[PDB]
């Protein structure tokens, strides 16, 4: 999520672009996912539940 503030752009648009890039990279979701241990059965059950609810 490297953001180089190019010329003739205000700071606010650069900050919003940085946020958009860091959310499309998914770094916050990953660092929130990795802070506690999730058992293999727990992650398998969660993936199965997510795949089941992705049917509508």
């Amino acid at each position: 999520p490297v953001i180089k503030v190019r010329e003739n752009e205000p700071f606010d648009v650069a900050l919003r672009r940085f946020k958009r890039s860091c959310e499309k990279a998914g770094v916050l979701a990953e660092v929130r996912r990795r802070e506690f241990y999730e058992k293999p059965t727990t992650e398998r059950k969660r993936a199965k539940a997510s795949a089941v609810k992705r049917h509508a």
Binding site: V5, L15, F18, C22, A25, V31, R32, R34, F36
Partner: protein, 117 residues
């Protein structure tokens, strides 16, 4: 206390606190300020306002160095990720780059156990 005009703003945005450290291009720290050291303890410490005032006080700890253009390296999931950047830009600083350097292990060490709260 000489003139740098080229710095880096290392923001350590943890869940419980926010640490802002302004170093030169090489990595030698010139000044630092935290949310807990700015008059905020407990619930007020993990807020974007505390991170903002910490970035304000850290920008004052480097006024003797005369920094004009400085980089931003955000690290951590906690609040104050963008609040410190806004407080640094408002302090008369030319933000040249913003970079997320949050450490991501490629499935390395085992994290602690889940909290049964």
């Amino acid at each position: 206390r000489k003139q740098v005009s080229d710095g880096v703003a290392h923001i350590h945005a943890s869940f419980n606190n926010t640490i802002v450290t302004i170093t030169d291009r090489q990595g030698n720290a010139l000044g630092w300020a935290t949310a807990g050291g700015s008059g905020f303890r407990g619930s007020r410490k993990s807020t974007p306002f505390a991170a903002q005032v910490a970035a304000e006080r850290c920008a004052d700890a480097v006024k003797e160095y005369g920094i004009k253009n400085l980089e931003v390296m955000v690290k951590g999931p906690g609040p104050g990720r963008e609040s410190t950047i806004r407080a640094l830009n408002a302090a008369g600083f030319r933000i040249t780059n913003i970079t997320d350097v949050t450490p991501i292990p490629h499935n390395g060490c085992r994290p602690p156990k889940k909290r049964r709260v």
